[PDB]
Every structure is written in C-alpha cells, then in structure tokens.
Structure 1
Amino acid sequence: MKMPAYEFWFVVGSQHLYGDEALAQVEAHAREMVPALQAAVGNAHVLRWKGVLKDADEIRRLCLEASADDVCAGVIAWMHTFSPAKMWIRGLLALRKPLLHLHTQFNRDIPWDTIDMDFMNLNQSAHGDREYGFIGARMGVARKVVVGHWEDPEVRERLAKWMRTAVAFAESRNLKVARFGDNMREVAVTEGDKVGAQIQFGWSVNGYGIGDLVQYIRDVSEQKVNELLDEYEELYDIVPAGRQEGPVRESIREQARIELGLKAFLQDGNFTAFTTTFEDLHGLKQLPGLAVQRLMQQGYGFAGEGDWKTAALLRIMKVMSTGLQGGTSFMEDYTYHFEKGNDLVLGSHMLEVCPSIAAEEKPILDVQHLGIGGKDDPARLVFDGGEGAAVNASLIDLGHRFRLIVNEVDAVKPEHDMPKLPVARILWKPRPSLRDSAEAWILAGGAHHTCFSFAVTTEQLQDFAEMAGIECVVINEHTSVSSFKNELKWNEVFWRG
C-alpha cells in the first residue's frame, strides 16, 4: 500500500512588539531548524516550513488552509518568543488536523557573559509556550506536548513517532471498510454503531454480498493465477503433495484465484480493510485463508467473523508502524499454558494469521482439513511466531462511546515443536503476569479478536486515542488490578458525555 505523501507544517509564533529586527532572528532560527530537523526522521515524512505567525488573521489563514489541505497531516507549533494567545483562539477553532506543541529552545546553554535584554527578548520560549499551553487547556483541544531541545535525539525520536501516528490518523479519517456478509450470529463484541464510528473516526463501513465477490473472482485472468502460483512456490515451501499437479495443488490455485479477485474488488472500491465471515460462504470453494494472509502482508486491514472495527484498527496500526521492521497481524487468544516457570499463551486464528509476525524460517504452504465453515479443505501459510516485545490492542463499543484496550506483552520463541497443529501460531507472556493481564482485560471488557504488533508502541496508541477523543486503557508492567478497577470507574465518569 502507498499513501498520498503527507506534510507537516512547522509554524513558529511571535509578536511585533519586540521589533522588526527580532522577526528576522526568529525566521533565521526556524529556517535553520526545519531542514536540520528534517535530516533526523526524516526522509520518510515531509516537514514544510510555513513561516512565522504574528497576527490573529495570519494564523487564522494558516489553520484554515491546513484544514483544507488533504496533504497536510498535522501542524507542529512552537512559540519562539511571546505570542499572545487570544490571536490563536479564532485559529484553533478551525484547525482539525492534530496539533503537536514543540516546547523547545534554540540555543542549548545560556551565554552567561554576553546575555542582554535583546537575548532575553529573543529566546524566551519558556513562557511563550506556557501562554500557548494555557490557551490549549482553556479551549480543550487535543494536543501532543513534547518538551526538550530540538537537537536532543529523544525529542527527534518522539517527533518521528508522533508523525507516524498522525499520518495513520489521516488515513483513518478517510478509511473505507468492506464487509462480505454479516456478523457471526449472536456475537456481541463484533457489534457496534457504524454511524457513531464514522462520526468519531471517519470510517465508512459498508456491507457487500458475497456474490459480488464471487462475481469478481469469475473475471480474474488465469494466466495471472499461474504466474502467482510461481511466486508462491518461490517464496513459500509448498508441501511435496502440492508441489506436483494433484488435487492439493488446485486448492492452492483456487486460493490464488480468491486472492486475485479480492485484490480486484478491494482496488476498485478504494478499500483498505475488509472482513469475511464463515457463516456466509455461498459461492466460494473454500474459506479464504492464504488470500487474506497475503492481503494482510500487502497492508490491508482484516478481521474474521465480520469484525469491521478490529480490521480497521489493524489497518491503522499497520500505517502507524512504518518503522519498516514492523510485525502486525490479526489475532485471537486461543489457549493458556499454566506452567509455574513460564506462564504463556498460544494465540492464532482458524486460518488467517499474517506472516509479518513470522520467524526467519520461510513459512510453509500447506493444505489441511478445516471443518468450521463446511467448505473445501483450505490452503494456508504455517509458521511459528517471532520473539520480542509487542502490543496487542482491541477497540470495543460500550454503546455510547468507544474504548481502546492495549496490553504490552513479550512474545517468546517456542521451546517445543507443535507437529499436529496445522495453523500458524504465536506464544507470548502478557504483562504484568498471566492472572493480572487476564483479569484486567476481562474487567475492561476486552474483545477476543485482537490486533497484535511488534512495531506499534503504547505511546502511539495513546496518541491516536487522544486525536480521536476516546479512552485508552493500558495494561503493562505497573498495572495493579485493584487500582485498575478504580481507574476504569473514574475514566467512565470522565468520558461520559
């Protein structure tokens, strides 16, 4: 997936009171910082220099054009000198893209010997940013605040992380989701108000019949299915039974047909996420398995059993984790392992696990019996899950508002092999332990379908929740369950209304 290049407008605030001379000093400092801060991180995204802003009307024009530009994904604001905040009121009302408030100073030390009134009037960010911060508090605007020196490497790393989530938010705003079928019957976590989700996040989620998708698979070029079968054999290890032209190899060709038809449909409608349900497979030979795994590799959002929210959420987590070495997948929490030394959980799905979370071992393509769905034996990629720290998140619908639950876990490498299990799986230790992660997750109402990621941080998800105006609950190393209960109660009283 490629996305429209996004920009970030770097804006400095100032006054006319300190003279026409100081304005040149500010402009010079900013023209010095923006390209050097664009070196940093850097090349992935674009920092554009949008001038010094001194009057209310000038800044109002800026944030109105920012709200009109689809390429602008956020404004970074910094008060170099003292800018009076009432000028920013009329402006902040119109600006809708996310605001980063960069509280920095140009110089790093105070020149104790040669500091005069002119310097004290030029590099006074310490209270100008305080003024701006107050206006941001009194208007109640969603804002990230990053404090430090702009040459300090942690501030640069934080800027990169924020820009990543901001472009993910921009894609979320125009997000299209396609559902083939309906929900698994009587399932509650999968249900939500689509209209409320579009007013909150902007997701347009629409339901198509499965027949339209079968119709799209009818018009796929078979030359392409054989050429794609060649790429499968080059990338994955086909079972010897399926390396020759038997019945098991036609199931792989059938899954290639399904993938190409899904590609055609998703590309025609500008969809970035889709969902399928096993309860509605009238016209397909087999339940889509390998196809959805490859589409997840391509960058598409997916979730099973008709879960449009979790699919959308993984699409957003896919986009906010372009620190190339990602690792992101649809997940379900299947079973526990209660051994006192290493309490761990085995997670997977019926078929649809993305290979982004795999191990250096090349995944193996296999066909095996799947009785859930009542269809033909499906083809799937099988692999063990990698090892490292990760986060698994789920978005749920409380009825009047959304909740984002994120649990930091550590994925561990499997000690033993699992020979009779014919689906890809991953093993992890949740934090702060098994009993406390599970208890806290149940208390928060967490879903069973989860979005697992190696490259999304807790900061990124908290920042997305802040841009979207939704509660974010975090279960990590410091989470006590007794206090987590009261945290939930107080959050519910805050977010009501």
Structure 2
Amino acid sequence: MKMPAYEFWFVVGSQHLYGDEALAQVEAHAREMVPALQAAVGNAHVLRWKGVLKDADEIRRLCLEASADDVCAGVIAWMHTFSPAKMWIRGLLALRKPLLHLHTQFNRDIPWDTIDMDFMNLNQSAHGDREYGFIGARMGVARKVVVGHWEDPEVRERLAKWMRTAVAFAESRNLKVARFGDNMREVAVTEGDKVGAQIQFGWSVNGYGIGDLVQYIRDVSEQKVNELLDEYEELYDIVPAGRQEGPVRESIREQARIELGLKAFLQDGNFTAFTTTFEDLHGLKQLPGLAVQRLMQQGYGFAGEGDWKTAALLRIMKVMSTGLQGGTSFMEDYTYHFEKGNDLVLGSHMLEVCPSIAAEEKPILDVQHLGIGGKDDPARLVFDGGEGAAVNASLIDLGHRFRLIVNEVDAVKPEHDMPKLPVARILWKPRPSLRDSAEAWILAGGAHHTCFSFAVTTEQLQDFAEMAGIECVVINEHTSVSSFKNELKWNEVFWR
C-alpha cells in the first residue's frame, strides 16, 4: 500500500582500456538515460545513478553498500563497454539485493556513415553484456535479463514491472506475519517450515494467542469505532435492516472494534500480514470478517486457518501491484459450474475476501449466520468479483524446498446474481481449461488457498521466484498436462 522509500541503483560497466574521454562519453550516455527512465515509468520508485564502474574494488564496494543500505531494493547493471567479469566476481558474490542485467544500447540505429573505431570501443554493449552474462551463469546468480533499446516501450514496461517486483521482494525479505492461533487442525498444505521460510524469503512468522488480540480489542475507543461505522455507512451499502440501532448494527460495530484492535496490534508490531483461525477464537464475539476484508483492502496480507504462506504471498502480491488498478485478494476455489462454453469456478473464502477485486459498484455490508467457529452472526462485505485477465498463485512447502504455482485465469462477470449466497464471490474460467487447469494444479499440489490478482503479471511472480530461489511453475493458455507432468519431474530434480 505505502511505507518505506525504495530506490534502484543503475550501474554501467566499462574499463580503463579506452581511457577517460570514453569513460566521460559512457558517463554522459548514462546520465541522459537515467532521468528519462525515471520520469517515464517512474515517479513512484527512485532510480539512483551509482556511476560507471571500471575498478574491481569500486564494483565490490558498490555491491557491499547496496547490500548494507536497506533502501536499495535492487541493482540495474548495464555493460556499455566491455567490462571484464573477473572484477564483478567478489562484488556479485557480496550483492544481497536483486540484480537486473539490462542488456541495452545507447544508440537505437548504427550511424552507417561515421562509425570510427572510437564508436566500436564505446557502444560495444552487444558483447560486454555477453561477457558479464557468462559470469552470471558461471556463478549461477539469480538475475533478470532485459534486452533491447532503453527508450523501447517493451523495455521500460519490463523495468517498471521488475522494480515493483524487487520492492515486493525487499518487503518480503523483512516481512512480519502475526498468526492469531495455529493452523486449522489436520490440514497439510496450510502447514509448513516457518524457519525454512525465513531462510528462503526472510518472513518473520510468529504466533500470538487470540487472548493477545482480545486484549487489543478491549482497549479500542468506542469513539474511533463510532467514527468507523460512520465511514462504513458512507462507503458500503449496509442491508437496510442494519442502519437503525439493532443487534445487526451492534454486530457491525463488533467488526469495527475487531478492525481497530487488529489494526492497533498489527501497527504496534509492524506486521504487514496476519492469519486468523476459526478453531481458536476465545474472546472474539465473532469471526474476524469485515475487519479482515477492510484490512486486506487497506493492503495487509491475510489468510484463514493459520495459512501464513498464502497470507505472506498476499502482502507480496499487494505490494507487487501498488500503482496498477487490478486489485489482489485471498481466494479459495469453492464450487465448479460445468457448461459447454461457460466452464466457471466460483471462488469466495469462508467470508474474508478483499474488496479490491469487486466490480464498479456495491460493496453490500450483510450479516447472515455462520456455523464455522461457533460464534455470533459475523458482519461481512458481499460483492460480485470484477472481470478480466487475472492470476491465481499458491505457495506450498514440499519439505526440502518451496514451489510457487501460478494459474492465469480470466475473471467473468456473473450473468446470474445469487441472492442466498451471503459472502463475496468471483467467477473465472481457468486457462487453459477448467479440466486441465485443475488436473495440473492437483499434480503440482497447489493449496486450496490462493492469491487472486488482476494487477500481478505472471512475469512478476516468475521474477520474484527467480530472486527468492524457488521453482515457479505456471499453468496457462499453453499448458499441456502431458508436458506439465514432465516439467514437474525435471524441476523437482533441478531444485533439490
């Protein structure tokens, strides 16, 4: 949603072979490129010019400082001239921030008429980037490679997506998840290795008793709550049997108290994701719902049944998208519709699903009965899901490693409204086809719990997997279950 200032260090590789007139000419070319790259597809993320690097020491220092400086979200290296890779070795080793090797070229076209030797010793990026690329593969460093002219619209989009990803990665690297209660009992995919997750992604995932959150809701001012119900009334379409001071209003007031208690707790521990479990709610009047839905809109990561993995992922996919319109939500594939041309999946968690995936209008604020958790009638936001190309991502623990499964799906506007369904919902046709998406998904072992996002590209999730050093398997338009099983087997071998 917001918070810490993140910049990206642009770096250019050269050598002392072509002397100082060439080092000035590359520095000139860079000092022009950087600000155009900034104000065009920037504003949000600062793009620092960290100089032309020729010295082994200079490179190694730069990398160390990039690792030390919390504000450096990533390094964007480009070899304008031939920069010998053995200088980058100790540097690339010590570089703990995500690196993008930008294989570009200052001049779009070749100036056929005037192409002296001095131009071949200056705009030679074509092979200075290849030399660098070799040390990249040799040292097996996880790097994004973007190729093309730097003014190119394709390249500026890839730089912009990559910078949003590397910010999501930096937020991940010190992500703080609070779990209220443990996993839903006997559930396997919601379980995981929390310490192994800190090794891989950095996630501090820490368990609090529900009594620790009750203590926070007991401390919430009735005034701040009352103001919040005012904001509800103005923002959402409360069931008419809920504006008069009824037990229904007091049930919406209780979610307001839970929202401001959660918000208070989360902010007091700098938590950006959390998890509630219905199997442990002792001291809550009702299951956190509208509160959780509002916090997710407010951009917090969340997942039910203690699912820290998909809650973390939700936060990561929310901060992956900040700028773009789409919206990102916690999701559970609940029911299929089988029709020849209209093969739908109805996704809608228990009751906690983020308004960011809602259509042009509505958010209706209902409060029907819930059986799960055995608590008071819990207030919720209900709303039809939007439409358009989307992404359904689960993160799972295979024991020895993590696997990110991503399903490209197309959200679809509901042709029929469903009056008795007292939870927000969204329909989607999964690529390549319901039958083959679900087959491949089950084969990959994807969780029941997913992160549904319009805004997050697949490229975005694959980049984040490359940085974080996990398999990222995708099931989309081109996915053949036959080939996909083989790709699962060969990845398993690669990643262990």
Matched, 1:470 2:470: yes
Partner of 2:65: 65
Check whether the contact 1:405–1:474 (CA below 8 A) recurs between aligned residues. Answer: yes
How far did residue 115 of structure 1 move?
0.8
User: What do residues 292-335 of structure 1 show as CA deviations (whole Å, max 9, x unaligned)?
Assistant: 00000111000001101110000000001113303110110100
Distance in 1, Cα, partners of 2:3 & 2:408? 28
Residues 304-343 of structure 1: matches in 2 within 5 Å?
A: 304-343=304-343
Check whether the contact 1:277–1:306 (CA below 8 A) recurs between aligned residues. Answer: yes
Distance in 1, Cα, partners of 2:338 & 2:487? 28
Distance in 1, Cα, partners of 2:84 & 2:417? 65
Check whether the contact 1:275–1:303 (CA below 8 A) recurs between aligned residues. Answer: yes
Distance in 1, Cα, partners of 2:124 & 2:288? 60
How far did residue 36 of structure 1 move?
1.1
Residues 171-190 of structure 1: matches in 2 within 5 Å?
A: 171-190=171-190
How far did residue 3 of structure 1 move?
2.1
How far did residue 200 of structure 1 move?
0.5
- Please give the secondary structure, in 2, of the residue aligned with 1:389: strand
Distance in 1, Cα, partners of 2:267 & 2:149? 44
Distance in 1, Cα, partners of 2:190 & 2:417? 33
Distance in 2, Cα, partners of 1:93 & 1:189? 34
How far did residue 165 of structure 1 move?
0.2
Check whether the contact 1:235–1:362 (CA below 8 A) recurs between aligned residues. Answer: no
Tell which deviates more after alignment, 155-164 or 30-39: 30-39
- Please give the secondary structure, in 2, of the residue aligned with 1:86: helix
How far did residue 443 of structure 1 move?
0.4
Distance in 2, Cα, partners of 1:342 & 1:238? 32
Distance in 1, Cα, partners of 2:436 & 2:130? 40
User: What do residues 408-437 of structure 1 show as CA deviations (whole Å, max 9, x unaligned)?
Assistant: 000000001101111110000000001100
Tell which deviates more after alignment, 388-397 or 1-10: 1-10
Check whether the contact 1:346–1:425 (CA below 8 A) recurs between aligned residues. Answer: yes
User: What do residues 68-105 of structure 1 show as CA deviations (whole Å, max 9, x unaligned)?
Assistant: 00000000000010111101111111001011001011
Tell which deviates more after alignment, 457-466 or 108-117: 108-117
Distance in 1, Cα, partners of 2:246 & 2:436? 50
How far did residue 42 of structure 1 move?
1.0
How far did residue 37 of structure 1 move?
1.2
How far did residue 247 of structure 1 move?
1.0
Distance in 2, Cα, partners of 1:205 & 1:417? 39
How far did residue 141 of structure 1 move?
0.4
How far did residue 362 of structure 1 move?
2.3
Distance in 2, Cα, partners of 1:493 & 1:257? 50
- Please give the secondary structure, in 2, of the residue aligned with 1:330: strand
How far did residue 350 of structure 1 move?
1.1
Check whether the contact 1:9–1:47 (CA below 8 A) recurs between aligned residues. Answer: yes
- Please give the secondary structure, in 1, of the residue aligned with 2:131: helix
Normalised to the residue count of structure 1, the TM-score between the two structures is 0.99
- Please give the secondary structure, in 1, of the residue aligned with 2:335: strand
Matched, 1:136 2:132: no
Distance in 1, Cα, partners of 2:490 & 2:96? 28
Partner of 2:94: 94
Check whether the contact 1:432–1:479 (CA below 8 A) recurs between aligned residues. Answer: yes
How far did residue 13 of structure 1 move?
0.7
User: What do residues 11-63 of structure 1 show as CA deviations (whole Å, max 9, x unaligned)?
Assistant: 00101111111111011111111111112111011100011111100111100
Partner of 1:146: 146
Check whether the contact 1:323–1:455 (CA below 8 A) recurs between aligned residues. Answer: no
Distance in 2, Cα, partners of 1:109 & 1:336? 53
Distance in 2, Cα, partners of 1:336 & 1:139? 46
Check whether the contact 1:176–1:271 (CA below 8 A) recurs between aligned residues. Answer: yes
- Please give the secondary structure, in 1, of the residue aligned with 2:321: coil
User: What do residues 444-489 of structure 1 show as CA deviations (whole Å, max 9, x unaligned)?
Assistant: 0010011100000000000000000000000000000011110100
- Please give the secondary structure, in 1, of the residue aligned with 2:88: helix
Q: Percent identity, aligned pairs only? A: 100
User: What do residues 269-305 of structure 1 show as CA deviations (whole Å, max 9, x unaligned)?
Assistant: 0100000000001111101110000000111000001
Distance in 1, Cα, partners of 2:340 & 2:24? 66
Distance in 1, Cα, partners of 2:273 & 2:410? 27
Count of residue pairs brought into register by the alignment: 496
Pairwise CA RMSD: 0.7
How far did residue 370 of structure 1 move?
0.4
Check whether the contact 1:299–1:318 (CA below 8 A) recurs between aligned residues. Answer: yes
- Please give the secondary structure, in 2, of the residue aligned with 1:243: coil
Partner of 1:282: 282
How far did residue 152 of structure 1 move?
0.7
- Please give the secondary structure, in 2, of the residue aligned with 1:365: strand
Distance in 1, Cα, partners of 2:397 & 2:20? 54
Name stretches of at least 5 consecutive residues in structure 2 with no aligned partner.
Answer: none
User: What do residues 102-142 of structure 1 show as CA deviations (whole Å, max 9, x unaligned)?
Assistant: 10110011111111111111110111001000011111101
- Please give the secondary structure, in 1, of the residue aligned with 2:121: helix
How far did residue 2 of structure 1 move?
2.0
Name stretches of at least 5 consecutive residues in structure 1 with no aligned partner.
Answer: none
- Please give the secondary structure, in 1, of the residue aligned with 2:73: strand
User: What do residues 164-218 of structure 1 show as CA deviations (whole Å, max 9, x unaligned)?
Assistant: 0000000000010000111111100111010100000000100000001001111
Check whether the contact 1:382–1:423 (CA below 8 A) recurs between aligned residues. Answer: yes
Distance in 2, Cα, partners of 1:288 & 1:51? 51
- Please give the secondary structure, in 1, of the residue aligned with 2:439: helix
